[PDB]
Every structure is written in C-alpha cells, then in structure tokens.
Amino acid sequence: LKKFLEDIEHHFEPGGKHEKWFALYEAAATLFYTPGLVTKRSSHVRDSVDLKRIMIMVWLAVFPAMFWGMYNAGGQAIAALNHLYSGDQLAAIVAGNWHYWLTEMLGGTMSSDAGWGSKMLLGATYFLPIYATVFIVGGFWEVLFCMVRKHEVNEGFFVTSILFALIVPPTLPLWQAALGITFGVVVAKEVFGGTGRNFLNPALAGRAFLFFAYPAQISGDLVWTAADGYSGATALSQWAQGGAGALINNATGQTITWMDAFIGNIPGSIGEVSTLALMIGAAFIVYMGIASWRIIGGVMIGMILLSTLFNVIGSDTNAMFNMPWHWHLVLGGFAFGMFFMATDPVSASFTNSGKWAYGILIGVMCVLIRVVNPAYPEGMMLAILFANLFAPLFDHVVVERNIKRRLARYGK
Amino acid sequence: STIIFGVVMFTLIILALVLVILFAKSKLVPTGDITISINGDPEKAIVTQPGGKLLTALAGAGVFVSSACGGGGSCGQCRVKIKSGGGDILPTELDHISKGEAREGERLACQVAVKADMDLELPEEIFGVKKWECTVISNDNKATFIKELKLAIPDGESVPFRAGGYIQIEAPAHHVKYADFDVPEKYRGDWDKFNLFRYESKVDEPIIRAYSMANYPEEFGIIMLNVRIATPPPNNPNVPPGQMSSYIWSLKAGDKCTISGPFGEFFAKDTDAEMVFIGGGAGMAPMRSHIFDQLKRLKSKRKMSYWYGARSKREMFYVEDFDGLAAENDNFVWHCALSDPQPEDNWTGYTGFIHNVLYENYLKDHEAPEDCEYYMCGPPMMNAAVINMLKNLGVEEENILLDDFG
C-alpha cells in the first residue's frame, strides 16, 4: 500500500490529472499512513496527539453503546412482533418486511426463542442503512466543500456521522436521514468553515431539523420500536402521563425497573438506551482527557438541583414533578447527550469556569423541558442547542473578569 | 360624527407631541455660540454658531486647512490636533489615522462635527496660509502631455515654501476647448496622430486641486511649475476630459490664477545618507527643486542620483539643465531610460522601464541599498512596481517617501 500510495501521488499532483480529487486522495493516503511532516520552526517536537486520534477515540467510545443498541433494537422489535402476531400471521409480516426476512436469510429467527445473535443482527439491519446513508451523504458534502474551497478533508465528520445515526429512532426513513445530516453538516458546520470553526453542535442540529421538520417520524408511539404495526410509549412519555406506576413494557408485559432503564432494556433511540454502556465509553474519553469532566459535572449538578427542586415543590397534576434525579439519569437521551454531545469542545465554552456554567445550563434546561414543556417528553437536544448559543457569553463574562484582574496588575 | 372626532383627535395628538418636542428642545438644547481656540492665541480664537464641520469654520478665519477629498473624510490631508473636545475618534477617521496618532489627538476636521467647545493646536504651516493671485507668464508645452507653467508673484517678494511643496489652485466654472491650447510643432505632430484637440471640457462648478512646485527657494520672481493634462482613458472614451489641468492649459501670458498659499509634506532628510530620486511625468517638478536646492542653496556634497522614466526622446525635457548640473557638480548624476525609442531617436543607452533598468544597473551592486533615502513621484504603475523591487532589496517604508500625482 505504501508503494502504491507514494507512486500515484504524481497523478493527483497539480501537474497531473485528477487534481480536483487531491483533497480526497491525500485524505486516503494520510488516513492510512501518518504523514512524514517534520516541524518547520519551534516547537521542534510536538505532542503525539493529533485530531485524527481524538476523533477515533470518541468513535470507539460509542461502540459499546452502538452494539448494545442494535441488540436492544432487535430485542424490542422481536418481542413486540411475537406479542402482536403468531403463526401464519407472523409469517406474512416477516415476509412483508425486508428487515425481517433478511434476518431469516442470514441465520436469525424472528421467533421469541431468538438469542442475542438474531436480535443484534435484526437491529443491524436498521442501524447500518441509516449509518451508511448518513456517512455517504454527509461525507459527500464534506468533500464537496473541501474540493471547491481547496481545503484538506477533516476527520471530525467521523464523530458527527456516528452520533447522528445513534440518536434517531430505529425506524427513521433513509431519505429523512439524508436531509438531517445534510442540514447538520452544511448549515451548521461547512458554511462556518468546517470542523473547529462553528458554534452549534452539528449532529444535534441535524436531529433538530428532523425534530421540527418531520415530527411524526421522530416522536410519538410508532417510531421507537421496529415492529411494524406496534404502538408503544417510552418510559419518559409514560412517566409524564401516570408517573412511576405507568412505566410498563406492553410488548413483554413487565414493569420497567430503574435497572432496566440503566442497562438499556427499553425502547428509544438506538444508542441512548444503555446508560451503563455510555458510562463505560465516557469513562475512557474522560480519563484520556478528550471529554471535559467540568461540563459533565456541571450537567449533573444542574440536573440534580432542578429535579430535586421539582421533587420538593410537588405537583398533584404534573407527574414529571416527582421524577427523581436518578430516574432522569437513565431515561431518554440524557446520558448520551451529557457524555458525547455536551462535551463537543468546539460548541462548548472555552474557559474552565464557563464549562461549569455551560454544563449547569444544559442540565437545568433538560429537566425544565422534560417537566414543564408538555409538547416534548425530552429536551436534551434542545437544551444543548440552547446552551450552545450562550456558551460564548459565559466565556465573555469569565474573560472580562480576567481582563479586570489584569488592568489592576493582579493586585501586585 | 365619528369623522369629526377623529379629525380633531388626530390634530390634538400631533400638536401635543410636537409641542412637547419643541418645548423640550428650548429647555434642553443650548443655543449659545461655540468658541474654538486656534493655537491658543486669543486673536485666532474663532467664535462660531453651533452646527457645521470644523473645516468650514476654520476656512472663514485666517487659518486655512488643506483638503483634497473635502467633506468625505477620504484623503486625510486635513488632519488637526484636537487637544480637548470633539468626542471620541470616529471609526471612519481611524481608517486614515493610526491608533498612536489618535492618542496624540490627530483628527480630521471635515469628519469632525462641531457641537461643543474644542481646543486646537494647528501648526505654523497651516496657520501661515496666504492667498495670492499670480499672473501666468509662459505656458509652453515641455513634452507630449506635460506643460511648464510660470507664475508671477502679485504682491512682490516670493512665495515662502519648502522644497517639494505644493500650492492649491482653485478655479471657477469655465468652458474650455482643447483646440484653444497652443502647442509647439514638435509635439503637435504627435498630437495630430490622435487629434486630441476635438475634446472639449465644461467645468460646471468651481474646483480645487493641488500642484507641486518646480522652483528652488533661491529663485525669486518666477514660480516654475509643471502641469499634466487630464484626458479620458484611451480604453475608456466615455469619460469627461480634464477640468482643472485643461483650464490651466487654456491660459497664456497675462492670465491670472489663485494659489491659496503653499502646502506639502514631501521633503528630504537633513543627514549624510545618499539620496536617490525616481521621477516620472509631472514628478519632474518636485525633483528639480531638490537637485537645485542641494547644489547652490545648500551646496551639499552628498551623493545624488536621478532616475526619470520616459517613453521617447520627445517626452524628455530639462535635459540641458540636467547636463549642466551633472557636469558642474559630480556629486549629482542623472539617468533616463526610454520604454520605446522612436525610429529617429537612435538611442544607444538604457532601453526599457526603470523598474528593472535601475536594479540591473545600480541597486543590484549597491552595497547598502537600504542605507539610502528614496523619493518617488510618477505614474502609479511605475511607483507600485518600483517599491516592490525596493521591498525585495530590504528597503524599509520609512526610507522611501512617495508623492504620486496619479
């Protein structure tokens, strides 16, 4: 590969043809092989870390959540299908859905005796097409801007593509996934100059676009389980209706315990369900210093304080008032947003003091939307997007206090 | 019925609103006269009513401030030192004034609106402006598009100015046809190639421009000057012809024009560093004064060089004078290269543009090109190109002074 990559560089050079594809060919060469660049001036030595390794660490950090998500997505769907149909009726349903008979063809079974392999396989049939569509469509916009503007491709899109695919319902139509990533990549990032030069979270901007443009496909009772003809409310929606007592899984008929939500054995977005899986990945990137623990700490502080305040105030009518902090933690997309989306460094505050305020605002807003906004059962995406708008302001307040300390010579 | 009530109610509301505004203005907006001190002299202090720009009040008094763009804040030649008052510096002013200058208090009088008492410290040069109407003596054409103008002082003595200065010329509306101009036969033949006499200029309103001096200080009685005719671009015929330059060319012996005192900021440095001159077109006026000033007025022994850009032997002028100065004093040497010698010129010397000729002849082998004072005046193409070569030689901007005439 090394010899082939080096030799073909002549063609992609300005003298040779296909120069318009240099930004993509050089990306492949640099992607496979680290460049042989040496420092040109001081510092003559550099840290081993680079943008490529940072993104891959985040990309790997969500793998455990992604793998469980596929397993959970298949499990929820298979359970619902058997709870709704049986016998030849199930066979017709399986025959009328390419997700179902493709799983049968590859060795899985849609029967209730299905093991983890068939459930994970079935969940893959939903996740992979979404991820492939998001990667290809979003990657096309990335290369187009780089090619036209003569920029080198940036590796930040790897995190955006995977995260966006893991925050959508399993049943999301592909054509809507293409539009969602297109809005997030283009409107939120590229027109600002690409990775590191924007202010809004790209993946959440794409989800918000679908959230407000096609609400029927990303809300309600028909999108969070991939069993055709099945209707089931998620835990957050159920709590808003009848409190903790309403937390029931109709497909399986079993009550939803805190442990169930914690492990991720609940309907929802593929990737968000398992708080345990997200914590495992979040621990690594936080330990590695890639994700800010001040933002994560701030989010927890804001969530616990406001939720406890709602607990004390009480409400005989709004059941969301009595949801405790530890239930807020394991429900919806709070865990996913706090660890892998609130920590987006570009859209977060650039000062350590601001990061605390930035995270606290995120945590406060999520509970607020969850509790006192009837329309939306969850508000993590909206909370983060709202917090992005004010992150530069927290930095400005902190920096202006720094400037006042300096004009006083730090009291020296 | 309702129509009547609305009509009266409408008027009451409007009258009540304006009466409050009009009443408030009288009791909140002072109408006292504004007093501005010029250079701290009580006699020069000017009392002016509120309103208007600073450039207007000063002009009425005995101090005249140079201005090219006028009330647009574009040229920046009207910079004044405002010790106090006038508020903060406007963002447009910063475009032509550096931050350090703003700390000193430099401001544009035209861009500054007079609304409160202000203190000004205008220098002697701006303070000492005298308006005179000299008499035109000769208007012969020096070259194809260059005319030498001689002005006779009307009040006697001579105009006090420094080498490389200029005088602002103001003229009223007047219609002049290029056919009215008188040109020698030598240059007439070249003019006959395109028949530029067809052009006709009609200056609708009075105009003000600047013109550099071409007489060294010791010269008394005649104020030599060089004028370049303004014509529409060869590639853009749909442009009005010259308005101020054309009017000057229409004048002959016995004509009168105003000089409105001297001005300028183009001068040499009182040091022993070698001087280098790059003249072009109308630039031969200020350059000539420097050579004359440094030969008899000061009798300077410093090295002096001149590099004039010309297109043909006909364009060359003052050659006989230059030869005498070089021959009489060896400290000064002049050179010129022809960008396109005529077939009959039979030039056997430097050929091309001074952009590369000067480098390939003098600056290439110069041991300390940076340790030299550079003065330039000529077409923008020659000026812009030359500085790039000078920049490539490590010549600092502070060592080069530009006086481009356009």
Binding site: F192, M365, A375, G379, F386, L389, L393 | L17, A24, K25
Partner: protein
C-alpha cells in the same frame, strides 16, 4: 404570581427577536460587538418599559372603543398615536440625558436614535393592544420584552465575536452568515415554544 409568568413569557416563551422577528434590522446590524450590543439592549428596554405603559394609558383613555363618547370608537387612530408617542418619548429621553446625565448619554443616548421608529417597540405596543393588559401588566410585559430582546442580541454578539476564528465563504461573509446564525439561534429558542 401572575406577573412572573408574564415576565417569563416576554423573555423566553415569547422572544420578540427570534420568534416575532421584530427589530431584525438593528438586531442583525449592531450584533458584531458584545459591548455595543449590550448597550442597545439596555436602550431597547428603557424605550419598551416606557413606551408600552404610556401607550396603554393613551389607548385605554382615548383610543379605547366607547371610551371618550358612547358610540364612537377611535380604533383607527392606533398606529399614528403609538408611533408619535414612541417617537416623542425616545426623542425626549435622549435630550435630557445629554443635558443631565452625560455618562448615560454616551452609554444609552447614543443608541436611542436607532431605536426611534423601530419595529421592536411598535410591535410590542401593538401586541399590548391585540390583548387586554392592565397598566401593571403593561409595565411587566414591556420590561420583559426588552430584556428578552437583549438576551437574543447579546447572545448573537457572543457568537459573532466567537466567529472571528470562522472561515466563511465569500458571499456569505457578513450579512449572509449572520442570517444563518440567527436562524440557528431561533432553532435553539424553540425549546420553550410548547411551554
């Protein structure tokens, strides 16, 4: 009580800038610098907190139907009355600041000419007539709308200042990117829409 919801409604739930699109010309213009943007927001609040309650009394005492006389309703004299009154108060406030509060004139009076006949003030007063608000509600609403307007402009100024590091394509640089930026801001402010 009732006032806090009204104050909360006029800041977050109802956003005069990002939802009703009022004052966009000035909002999308002076947004470059946070310090200047903060000054305009303060100036807008002063005009709004004074304009709305003053117009509320005028509307309820003169323009309100069947108020001056029985059977006559001078509703059509609504736009002229409000715009004229708003112009007077803004103009009157500026002059007194330059005569008694020099420091406030530069901080607040400098922006007042822009706030004269501004869509932000007129729209807020118009909504105060489209509804039935008491004088106390008029003041709480007027103060709330201005502060919420200040929140959006001050937020947009932080983003624009942060965008000094951005690389916007030519054609979008300046106004074009700012409109996109404002659109993104409106996206995040729709979290309170259902509230």
């Amino acid at each position: 009580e009732h006032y806090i919801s009204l104050l909360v409604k006029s800041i977050f739930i109802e956003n005069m800038a990002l939802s009703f699109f009022l004052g966009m010309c000035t909002f999308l213009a002076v947004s470059k610098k946070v310090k200047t943007s903060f000054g305009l927001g303060i100036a807008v609040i002063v005009v709004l907190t004074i304009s709305v309650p003053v117009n509320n009394l005028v509307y309820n005492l003169v323009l309100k139907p069947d108020a001056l006389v029985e059977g006559v309703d001078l509703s059509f004299l609504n736009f002229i009355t409000f715009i004229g009154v708003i112009a007077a108060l803004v103009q009157i406030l500026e002059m007194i600041l330059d005569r008694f509060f020099p420091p406030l004139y530069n901080a607040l009076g400098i922006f007042l000419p822009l706030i004269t006949v501004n869509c932000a003030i007129f729209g807020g007063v118009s909504f105060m007539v489209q509804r039935d608000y008491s004088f106390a509600e008029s003041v709480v609403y007027g103060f709330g709308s201005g502060v919420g307007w200040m929140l959006a402009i001050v937020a947009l100024a932080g983003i624009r200042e942060k965008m000094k590091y951005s690389d916007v394509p030519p054609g979008l640089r300046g106004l074009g990117i700012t409109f996109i930026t404002a659109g993104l801001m409106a996206l995040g402010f729709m979290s309170f829409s259902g509230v």
